[PDB]
Design a protein around this ligand. Sequence first.
Ligand SMILES: O=C(O)c1cccnc1
Ligand SMILES: O=C(O)c1cccnc1
Ligand SMILES: Nc1ccccc1O
Ligand SMILES: Nc1ccccc1O
Lengths: 347, 347
Amino acid sequence: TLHALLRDIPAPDAEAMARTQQHIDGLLKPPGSLGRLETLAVQLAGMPGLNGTPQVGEKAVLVMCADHGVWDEGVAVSPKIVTAIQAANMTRGTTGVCVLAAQAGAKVHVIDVGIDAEPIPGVVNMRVARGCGNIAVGPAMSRLQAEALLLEVSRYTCDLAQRGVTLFGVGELGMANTTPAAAMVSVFTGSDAKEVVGIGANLPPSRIDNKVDVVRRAIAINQPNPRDGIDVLSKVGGFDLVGMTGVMLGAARCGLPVLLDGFLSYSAALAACQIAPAVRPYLIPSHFSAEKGARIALAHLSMEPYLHMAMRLGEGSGAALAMPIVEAACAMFHNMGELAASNIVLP
Amino acid sequence: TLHALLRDIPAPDAEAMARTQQHIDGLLKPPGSLGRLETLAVQLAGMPGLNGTPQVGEKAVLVMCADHGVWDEGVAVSPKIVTAIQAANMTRGTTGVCVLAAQAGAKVHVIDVGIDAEPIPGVVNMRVARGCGNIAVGPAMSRLQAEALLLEVSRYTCDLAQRGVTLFGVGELGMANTTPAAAMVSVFTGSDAKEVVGIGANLPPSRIDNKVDVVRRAIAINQPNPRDGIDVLSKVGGFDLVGMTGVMLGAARCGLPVLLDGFLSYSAALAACQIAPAVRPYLIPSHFSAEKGARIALAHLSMEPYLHMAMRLGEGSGAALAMPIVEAACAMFHNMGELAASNIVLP
Ligand SMILES: O=C(O)c1cccnc1
Ligand SMILES: O=C(O)c1cccnc1
Ligand SMILES: Nc1ccccc1O
Ligand SMILES: Nc1ccccc1O
């Protein structure tokens, strides 16, 4: 079922992209002057789920929530229960993603893939377990659990496409999750833990060393295979991370765009592209995370974010903030006048 | 009258800013996690025209249009008449700024400060002359003309504030205007012309040398005084550039924020800050222009743009694109829930 899914990811439509580029070149402006907005418009035009043109219909931010066993290693200063509390707030519209998504006209879908607490009413239930295993002493989960969640989340994502959603945004919520994120980045990029381990949610500078040590132990003990994204996710990842990877595989299979968020999302995207390179064309960066390993992770994905906001909240907040930018590419494409109609000729 | 104006620019309200910072720190998120969005919110709170809080009411983009005598030196490949044509399109909603401003819910005000063509119906008439003097052989205009336009535009800007406008965006339109922009940047920053002269609207690489030469001649012949922003503007600037400087002085006097656009706007802001350092606190960067001298100009203004879009259209298009970001800071500030209300305590 997963092989089928990965097999059916459509390649971008080069024909629609060429038509788009020609149309953009003819707009009321010096050719190429709107830079990355032009490039983004063309990219969108190549996505089969969008009907050959840069269009944006309904918008959704999927937030994957889960707890992590590695929290017990003292790698995070936020109380573990904050995952459960914030997930509930996500249903009240008071969180950072909620407020930014509301501003963008997007709906937030809160999905519980493994919070260590009783079920929260109003949150989508796809709970694998009450938190994943502590990666410092063994794997986060079984390969089977990782594959099942990928399928599950993937289907949910592409099913939203049937409800008019054309643009996705991915996000997470899970105390201590910048630890497995860093382990994955280290593994996929071949970078040393010290180079990609950050302060997460205000970790005191004095406790960084321990965090770096925990990441190295996780890798040494699990021996994840860099060439197998599912192996890496199941061993040194987490449920929230697997879920984000699933949103990306689902949107790609649906031929639709997905906006990345910050550091946690970069880790998930490295996994997704490792598992299926065909996913890459559908990914759109949003902002440049203030987390230490962001530069390395983005360099390996060959992505240059549009927004430099020193943000490090997570939740899909950056994804929501960039949605207007995607709408701008559409507006540009469909609403600008044409040079020829004004009798203007430029070399 | 100009001395009065400059004298009456209010300092930022430190009391409102402290109250803002405390409120932001108490929001549902790790302290400081929304980074530059938090900083922007505080900055807005200190602006007297906004009522002690980051608020955005009506939005306006002021586009200053004028022609330049230096066009005759072969520094621009766009036909001179494009200024007049595009200014007319600005009244039809088909231009790049129009489309992006519409997306942001802002109104575009097109102001003719010196187009070399017959008056265009629908465009605000503040025409100094039919194009400014060719800076390669003498000054763009008299000091008197520069001061009069500054006053004129300044009053117009702050008068809009009485109509509910709380956020301004500045833009321009004028063939060959990246030449005087570069001369001004060179003068204010002490950088050599070759380091700040760019391709403007697709100038062929083979004609760059001539453009660099024209900039040096302009400076040698006029001998503008770097410590006198009005001297520089009148000698090696242009009507559109003076006008943009005027919007900045007017918004500051009104105690309101102004969003910069690209390279031309950076030149105008260097002049504005030279003339009145008190203007600085009211300036908000938008994007990082793809023009060659952008880095140097931004470094001298100590500004780090939020958007990296490789844009180089001008017209205030970048300013419009960043307006949602300013609205996001307000949304964050007013709509997020508080940590205490959720019983969350973080170190
Ligand atoms: O980049 C992120 O999304 C991030 C960084 C630190 C802590 N939480 C989220
Ligand atoms: O940065 C700008 O605004 C710009 C650069 C080149 C040509 N026109 C405008
Ligand atoms: N629209 C346009 C066209 C040519 C040169 C500059 C411009 O802003
Ligand atoms: N709201 C929040 C609080 C603590 C840690 C991470 C979060 O996203």
